[PDB]
Amino acid sequence: HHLTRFPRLEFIGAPTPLEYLPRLSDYLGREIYIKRDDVTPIAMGGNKLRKLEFLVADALREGADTLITAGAIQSNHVRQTAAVAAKLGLHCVALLENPIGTTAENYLTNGNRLLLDLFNTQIEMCDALTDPDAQLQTLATRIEAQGFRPYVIPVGGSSALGAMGYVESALEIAQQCELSSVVVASGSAGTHAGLAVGLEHLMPDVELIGVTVSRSVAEQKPKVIALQQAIAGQLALTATADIHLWDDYFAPGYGVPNDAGMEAVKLLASLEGVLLDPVYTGKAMAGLIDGISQKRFNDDGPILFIHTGGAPALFAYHPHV
Amino acid sequence: MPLHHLTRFPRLEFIGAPTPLEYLPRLSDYLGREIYIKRDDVTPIAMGGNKLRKLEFLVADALREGADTLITAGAIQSNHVRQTAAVAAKLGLHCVALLENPIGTTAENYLTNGNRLLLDLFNTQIEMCDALTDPDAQLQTLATRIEAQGFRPYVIPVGGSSALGAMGYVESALEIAQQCEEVVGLSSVVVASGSAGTHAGLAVGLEHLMPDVELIGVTVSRSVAEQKPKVIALQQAIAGQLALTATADIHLWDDYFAPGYGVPNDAGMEAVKLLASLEGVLLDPVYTGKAMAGLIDGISQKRFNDDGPILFIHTGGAPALFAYHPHV
């Protein structure tokens, strides 16, 4: 209810499709549905756009002329922020790292990174995002002292404000489903947490599972919980639901493809004409599939996979590294 | 009323809702004229595009006749082939693609990245040829060999551009008319003109719904002399199928595609950079970049019949950006 008290820009408009996947369902022997948050009208789309609706509205209210964020070279978030900035006539400054130590030309210059150049993003390279919030604040102070009005967007757009975007997706989900499980990639945690708050109130019987793409359960759980509480607090709701996380599917680490993940990509492509990605959704789908094999879900009814986007990264990861 | 026979053709649901029609305030401010964009690049299937509109009718036709295989042709970086392959996968139809290298490039990203990468993901059977000198005959030869294996092939022509395929853009015109209604009085529409189905579909639709609007195709592969009869033939065939006449003159501009099909040019790349930096919109080096360069220059030279609002049809093509980088 209090969701409408938050300023937001319209970047998406109509609710994204929720689709049945008959061929994948037939193959896995389980009813699988997909939330197509990969289909959004801005610069090849994705989940970060839902967050930016709130974050950029806040930016404009604060009178910013510059958006500053951070991510890997192949960040979907940075690409979406850069496109949104260009659309609104805002400057954009991206703080980037190479998280996998690659020198592969396509990772360094193609995919999302190519798009950043098209969007006229000012690029700042750092050796590592060891303390992103801190490093972004340092950068913002320079730019502010330089004569600009920056607005800092945290890594993956995952603040309590940004995460409102995924409380919003939860409303679409609830509307469109009128299910036993929901599966989503859990990275910077805004998507997971927002969905957790929304689904708790809208679909309490449904098990929400985050498949981690960068961290162990131990490392990831406190982050998702912290966001869950902050979101609930700002909406004047209670959030008591357990956070469920599966960390078996991201090795050897963030932004490195693995076989299970790339095989998930091939499966969805060949069976459904759907495009996943090597960093996020492929790994999450690999988790979904294994959850079936291992009978890992609370019960064995329909599963909703949340497609958070990421496909432009296919072109940066080809042919390897 | 006049486009009612369109109801008769069976068609599949690939798009769902009408695609967004958006004002471009920053581009409009720069160009000194009201620019709107029809977002046909924003469709739900495998990175979208205009070809998906045609496939709705072509594939419905294939299913009706009991086909289990789709066969079509294009460049290695064809958007059509990629969209055909994606649809085939989704429907559990087999897909065979006859590909050529139209520009003689050895650049690895052209050969293996972009649309061509996606083809492998959709399990497309790839069939290379030196050139598409006679695509109708080459597709038919391939269909004979495919049929010998026991498949039931349905041949989709280059770009999905038959009268039936073009019905998708008659439908697009209906959307456009409804979307502009009481919101904007369009003076002009710009679309890239390639295999001609999109242009022809729009020509018939717009003649009957928005008769005063000037439709302009920017050629991406041929001169006016070569392209114009192709568009007209389709236009007349589309009108016939709908029990309508189509008396409108087809308008084409061929100044914006040199040195040739699939070869990027400066004006095209500047248009791509302009749309990206001003509107966060991604065009492509083969089709939309060149069409936009046409629009821009059309404003500059006052080539349009009337200087009112222009609607640019975004036909898609963005995955090729990754194939054309860093060069071909």
Numbering used by the authors:
A (entry chain B): 4 to 181, 186 to 328
B (entry chain A): 1 to 328
Share the article's original sentences.
D-cysteine (D-Cys) moieties are found in firefly luciferin, semisynthetic cephalosporin MT141 and malformin A. D-cysteine desulfhydrase (DCyD) is suggested to take part in the catabolic degradation of D-Cys and D-Cys-containing toxic compounds. The polypeptide fold of StDCyD is similar to those of other fold type II PLP-dependent enzymes and consists of a small domain (residues 48–161) and a large domain (residues 1–47 and 162–328). As in other PLP-dependent fold type II enzymes, the active site is situated in a large crevice between the two domains. StDCyD is specific for D-Cys and βCDA, and shows no activity with ACC, although it shares significant sequence identity with ACCDs.
Significant activity was also observed with βCDA (Km = 0.84±0.30 mM, Vmax = 173.4±82.1 µmol pyruvate produced/min/mg of protein). The crystals of StDCyD obtained in the presence of D-Cys and βCDA show the product pyruvate at a site ∼5 Å away from the substrate binding pocket. The additional electron density observed in the complex is consistent with two different binding sites for the substrate. One of these coincides with the canonical active site of fold type II enzymes and the other is 4.0–6.0 Å away from this site. The electron density observed at the active site pocket was not adequate to model the ligand used for soaking the crystals. The density could be modeled as a sulphate and two water molecules. The density at the other site 4.0–6.0 Å away from the active site could be modeled either as product of the catalytic reaction, pyruvate or final intermediate of the reaction, aminoacrylate. Examination of the residual electron density after refinement with various occupancies for pyruvate and the aminoacrylate suggested that it is more likely to represent a pyruvate. The modeled pyruvate is held by hydrogen bonding with Arg222 and Ser221.
